[PDB]
Amino acid sequence: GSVQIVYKPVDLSKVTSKCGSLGNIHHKPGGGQMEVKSEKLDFKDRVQSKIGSLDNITHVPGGGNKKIETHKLTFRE
Amino acid sequence: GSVQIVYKPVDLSKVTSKCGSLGNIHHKPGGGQMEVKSEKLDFKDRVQSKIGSLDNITHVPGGGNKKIETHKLTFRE
């Protein structure tokens, strides 16, 4: 009782950008005073906890192009 | 009395060709016979003078794509 399998994907994709100018970008957030206090905190298993976070990000990619792929092949008997 | 100038050209142009085949070209001009006559001849100040010319050209560029640009910025006070 034979079994043949042929997983032949083919991918010739493009993910592209041209851009003449990226320019004159400004990021002036005013100051936010923040105060953080606790008695007790418990984080038992697999926790992701952002708490009392002040963040300024200025992410300015000339490209910033992403591609993801995920080939899975699972055989079971 | 200030003067600013900012000459920021940006050029992302393309000038392009694909071609599958050029293929069979023939250039069989028959015979050419000609006469030019004068007594006396002079030239001055950068004269550019083709005379009595028999020419055969077979110019076959696989891609004959041309680009010219000319940025000029000219200040006087």
Residue numbers in the entry:
A (entry chain A), B (entry chain B): 304 to 380
What wording appears in the published article?
Paired helical filaments (PHFs) and straight filaments (SFs) were found in cases 1 and 3, while only PHFs were in evidence in case 2. The structures of V337M SFs and AD SFs, which comprise two asymmetrically packed protofilaments A and B with the Alzheimer tau fold, had also similar cross-sections perpendicular to the helical axis. However, unlike SFs of AD, the backbone traces of the protofilaments differed from each other along the helical axis in V337M SFs. In protofilament A, strand β4 of the Alzheimer fold, which comprises residues 336–341, was shifted along the helical axis by about 3 Å compared to protofilament B, which adopted a typical Alzheimer fold. Because β4 contains the V337M substitution site, this shift may have resulted from the presence of the mutant residue. It, thus, appears that, like SFs, whose interface contains a nonproteinaceous density between K317 and K321 from both protofilaments, TF assembly may also require external cofactors. Small variations among the observed structures of filaments with the V337M substitution revealed the presence of an adaptable region around the mutation site that explains the accommodation of the mutant methionine without disruption of the overall fold.
